Nucleic acid binder design. Sequence first.
RNA 1: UUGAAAAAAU
RNA 2: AUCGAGGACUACCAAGAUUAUAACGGAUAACGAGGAAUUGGGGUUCGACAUCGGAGAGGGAGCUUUACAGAUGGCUACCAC
RNA 3: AUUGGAGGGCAAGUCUGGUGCCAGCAGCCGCGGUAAUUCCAGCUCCAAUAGUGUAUAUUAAAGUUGCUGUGAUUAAAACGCUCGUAGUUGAAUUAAUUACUUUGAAUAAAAUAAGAAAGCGAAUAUUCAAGCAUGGGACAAUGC
RNA 4: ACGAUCAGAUACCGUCGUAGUCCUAACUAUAAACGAUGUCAACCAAGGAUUGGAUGAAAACCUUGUUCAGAACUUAAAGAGAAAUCUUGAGUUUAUGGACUUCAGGGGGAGUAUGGUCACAAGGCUGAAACUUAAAGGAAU
Lengths: 10, 163, 116, 72, 91, 41, 19
Amino acid sequence: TAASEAKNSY
Amino acid sequence: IKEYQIVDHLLPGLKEEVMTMQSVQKQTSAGQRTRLKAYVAIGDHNGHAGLGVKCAKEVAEAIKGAMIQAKLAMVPVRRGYWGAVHTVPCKLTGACGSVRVRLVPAPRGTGIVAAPTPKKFLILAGIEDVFTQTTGHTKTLGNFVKATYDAVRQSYGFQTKDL
Amino acid sequence: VRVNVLADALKSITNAEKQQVMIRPASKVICEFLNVMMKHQYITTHRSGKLNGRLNKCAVISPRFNVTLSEFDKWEANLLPSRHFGALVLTTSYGILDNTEARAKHTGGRILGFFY
Amino acid sequence: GRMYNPGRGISRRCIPEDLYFLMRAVSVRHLEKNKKDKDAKYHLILIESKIHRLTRYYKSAKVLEASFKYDA
Amino acid sequence: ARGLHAARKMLAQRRANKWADKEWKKGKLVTRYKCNPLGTASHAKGLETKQPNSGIRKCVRVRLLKNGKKITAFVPRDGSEVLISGFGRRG
Amino acid sequence: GRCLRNHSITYKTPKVPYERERFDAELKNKKHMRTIAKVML
Amino acid sequence: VAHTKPRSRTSKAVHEAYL
RNA sequence: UUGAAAAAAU
RNA sequence: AUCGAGGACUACCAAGAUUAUAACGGAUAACGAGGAAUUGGGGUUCGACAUCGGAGAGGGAGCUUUACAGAUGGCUACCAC
RNA sequence: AUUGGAGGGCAAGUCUGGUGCCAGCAGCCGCGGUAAUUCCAGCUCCAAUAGUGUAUAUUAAAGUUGCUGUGAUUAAAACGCUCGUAGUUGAAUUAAUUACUUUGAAUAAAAUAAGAAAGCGAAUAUUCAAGCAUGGGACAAUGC
RNA sequence: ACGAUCAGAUACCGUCGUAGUCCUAACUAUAAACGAUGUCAACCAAGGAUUGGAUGAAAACCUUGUUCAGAACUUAAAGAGAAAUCUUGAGUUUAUGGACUUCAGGGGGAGUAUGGUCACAAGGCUGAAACUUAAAGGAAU
C-alpha cells in the first residue's frame, strides 16, 4: 500500500 | 616497487627525459629559501612509463632524486588498435588539477597530435598514434605531465568487453 | 516532473553499477532497451509495474535526433569509447535496435541512448 | 510537489464537482470587512488560478460548453 | 531549452549573447566608419613614458587629409605628407 | 572567381616556426593518400 | 483491425465491441 | 584617556 | 485596359488583411546564386568581379520604330554639367 | 643573395668599443642610472630564400559565444518573491494526414573531390532547404 | 546647538534638541531583499537527536519500534572542486544531452550619456559609445 511507504531530494 | 633499482633490473635502459626544472621559494626572515624542483620522466618505449618529482638545493641532486621517484612510480600502459599495437584501446582522460587531458584512439598513420609536453611523455610510454584534447591551465607544466601520466595510468582499469 | 522514463531508468542503473537495481515505472521503451543490453550480455502492480560487473555507463540522449544511415559514423565517433566496444540504441521503423543490425536492416531513425 | 506551496506530501489512498468545490472563491470574496488582510488577497488569486486552469481544462474536454466564464 | 522543437530560442539566445563579445561587436556597430581615424584602411597619408621607464619619446602630430582629425604619431627609429600605419596592437 | 585556368599549392609550411627536433631532421632549399586510406578504413 | 479511420474501428475498441 | 606621516625606480 | 490572369483600373457592395511563429518600421560600407578562405567533427567569414538571373546608362519622367526597348554609342522636356 | 634576428616566447654570441633611466630598443615580459647577453656600431651564426620584413582585416588557436560545448557559493554572472499568457517540455496503455525513415525520379556548366601547377570525356558522386513517387510504422503531433 | 578631546575635530565621548520614530489613507518598489546557491523530477555511504502525524509496545505527558512530512547537525579511506569547502549537492559532467526560465564574457569609463517610460518628488526600470589600461580578481602557503 502506497501508505506503507508513507509514514527526498533531486 | 619500493626500490628504484628493481625497475632498473626488470626494465633496463630506461630512456631519460627531464621535463622541466621549476624553482620554488619559501619566504623567511632572512629572505627567500629557494629550491629547484625537477620533473623527470622515465620508461622504456613498450608500454611502461613513469613520472617522478623531487626538489632540493642543487640541480644535480634534485634530478638524481627525481629519477628515483619516477622509477618507483611505475605503471603499465595498455595499447591497442584503431580499427584493425599503436594506440590506446579506448578514450581515457587524466584528471589532474585544473588540467584535464583526454586520449582518443588514432589510426595507424597519424603521429602524436599533442602539445610538446604530453608528447615527450607519450613517446616514452610507447604510443605512436593518439588524439589529445586539453582543458585547463596547461602553462602549469607539473599538472600537465601529471594529467598525462594519470590518463595512461587508468588505461588498465577500464574493463572492456575483451576483459 | 517525470518527463522521460528512459532517462530516469538508465541513471538508476548506472549509479547502482557504479556502487541488482530497481526501476519503478516500466514502459514499452524501457524494457526493450534492456533486451539490447542483454543480448550484448551487459546485463544478466496495475500502475506500470516495477547487474554483473560489466556495465560501464548507460545513458539516454536528449531529444531523439533523427539519424540518417550516413550519420551513423558521427554518432559512434562521439558517444562510443572505441570502434569495438560500445553500442548505440536506435528506435527505428522495425523496432528498437542498435548500430549493428540497423546498419544491416538498412534503415535509420531516432536514437535513444547507449551503453559502454 | 504541491501546485503553489513547496510542500511535498504523499498522503494517498491505495486501491488494493471539483470545480464547483473551488467556488472557496466566494467564501473569501470575507474580504469586504477585512480589506487590510493581504494574506487573504494573495490566497484569493491562487484559488482563482486553480479555477481558470480547471475552467480551461473542462472546456477542451467538452464537459463545460465554452461559454463558461466565472465571475464575482 | 534543449528539446527538439526549441530551435527558435537557442538561435535567438545566441544572437543576443554575441553582442557581449567585445571583439565581435567592434566589427559590426558603426564606429569603424566614424570613430576610427583610419576608417577601415591600413595606412593613412596626412600632414614621457610610463612610471618605471624614464626618458622622452619623440612624437609627431598629424592632420589627416580626408577626415581632418589630429592624431599623435611615433617616429620609427633612433635619431629618426606622412604615411602612418598603426602599431603592433590593433586599435 | 578570377581565372578559368586551375592552380594549386604544392607545399605547406609547418605550424611551429622554430623547433630544434625539426631543424636537424630537415637538415637546394627546404621547399594526401593517407587520409584517403583513412576514410575507407 | 486496420493499419496503424475513427476510434470505432481500433482494436481494443472493436475487440471489446466484438467482446 | 591621546598615538598623524615616511619623495620615484632598482 | 492589357499579348493575356488579377484592384492592374473604374462604379456599386461588404469590413475586411497582417501581427509576439516578430507584423509595420529602421540599418547595411546588401545585387542574389553557382562558389571562395579556413576547417577533426560541428562551424565562422567572404562572393562588385569567369558562368546563370536581376537592374542601370549623370538625375527623374514621357515617347518613337519594331517581332522584342519604357532602348539612352534613338528622340522630347526639366534639373545639373 | 637578400630579408629580418641572436634575453625569453623562439633558432642563434654569457665576443669587443662607445653611450650612461640620455639617446634609444622593445607586438608582451622588459633592457638601459657609466662593466648593457636586448641601444648605436664591428665580427661571428640563426631561419627562410629570390624572397623576406611591417600595418590592416578573415579563419584556426577560441571548450574566450558554447547544437556537438561554456560558466553563474566565493573569480564576471540565479530576477526580492509568487501568480500567469504566448513558447518549450509533457507518465504508463491498444496486434486520416503529417513528421520520421528507405529507396528512386528529376537535378547548367565551371569549380570540389575524384578515374609540376596544367590541359582534356571519368559509373565520375555531390549540392542542401523545399517539392514528386515509394517500402516501413518503433518514437512522435494533429481529431476520431 | 552646546561642553569636551585634539595641531585642528565641522566626528567618535557627554548634555539638549526639529524632521523622523507610532496609527490611518494614498505613493515610492529599492537592501549584504544572502543560503551571495533559480524552479520541477529520479538515484546516492554511515549515525544520534529534533518539530506534527499514524500504527504497535509500554500507564493525555513521558520510555521504546515502525513506517512520511519539516528545520537541522555529526563522520567519511568515497564522489566533486582551483581550493576553502559541498554531501538531503556545489555528487550521479570530456565516460560531456532529464524538462524550463533568467543572467555573464579581462579591468575602467558606467549603471554614466542619449532616448523611452513609471512617480508629486527623491528616484526606479531599459541602457551605450568614445577613450584608457596589462592586469583586475579568487582560494589557499
